[PDB]
Design a protein around this ligand. Structure first.
Ligand SMILES: C[C@H](O)[C@@H](C)Nc1ncnc2[nH]ccc12
Ligand SMILES: [Cl-]
Length: 167
C-alpha cells in the first residue's frame, strides 16, 4: 500500500492520472520523481522547467555541478540526484526529443531506467515539448516498465484520449 490517490489502473503495475506532477510530488513526496531531462540537465521548460521552478532553482544548481563533474548524459540514459522539496530522489531520464531528430527507438531504453526503482511518480517520456506521440509513449511505458509507475498527465484533454484509446 502507498499514498498515491485517484489513479486509474492500466495494468498490474502501470497507473495513470490527470494531474500536475509538481503538485502531485509536493502532496505525495514520493521516493522517486522522474524528470523529463535533456542531456545537459538544463531544466528550462516543460516538466523539467516546472520541477526546477518548484525547487527554487536548487535542482538546476545541483545539476550544473553534476554536469561539470560528469559531462552530459546519454539520450536514453539517466542519473539519480536529489528530489529537493519534492521527493527523496529525482531520477533525471532523457527520452529522445523528436524536435531534435533523435531516434524514437531510444524511448524504450529511456523507460528501462525506471526498472531500477520499485515505485516512481513520472510523466510520459518524450511527450510534450519533446515531440513524441504520447499514445506511443504510454504504450512503450506499459511494455517496458515492470516496477510500479504512477503516470501524471497534466493536460486533461490528453488524459482522456490515452485512457479511451488504451489497449
Ligand atoms: C506528455 C507531457 O510530458 C506532459 C504530460 N507534461 C507534464 N506532465 C505532468 N506534469 C507536468 N507539469 C508541467 C508539464 C507536465
Ligand atoms: Cl511538456
Amino acid at each position: 500500500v502507498n499514498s498515491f490517490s485517484g489513479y486509474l489502473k492500466l495494468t498490474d503495475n502501470v497507473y495513470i492520472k490527470n494531474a500536475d506532477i509538481v503538485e502531485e510530488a509536493k502532496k505525495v513526496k514520493p521516493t522517486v520523481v522522474v524528470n523529463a531531462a535533456n542531456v545537459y540537465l538544463k531544466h528550462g521548460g516543460g516538466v523539467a522547467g516546472a520541477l526546477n521552478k518548484a525547487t527554487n532553482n536548487a535542482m538546476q544548481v545541483e545539476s550544473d555541478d553534476y554536469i561539470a563533474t560528469n559531462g552530459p548524459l546519454k539520450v536514453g540514459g539517466s542519473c539519480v540526484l536529489s528530489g529537493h522539496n519534492l521527493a527523496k530522489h529525482c531520477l533525471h531520464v532523457v527520452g529522445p526529443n523528436v524536435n531534435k531528430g533523435e531516434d524514437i527507438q531510444l524511448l524504450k531504453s529511456a523507460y528501462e531506467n525506471f526498472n531500477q526503482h520499485e515505485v516512481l511518480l513520472a510523466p510520459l517520456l518524450s511527450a510534450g515539448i519533446f515531440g513524441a506521440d504520447p499514445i506511443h509513449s504510454l504504450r512503450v511505458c506499459v511494455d517496458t516498465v515492470r516496477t510500479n509507475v504512477y503516470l501524471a498527465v497534466f493536460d486533461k484533454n490528453l488524459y482522456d484520449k490515452l485512457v479511451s484509446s488504451f489497449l
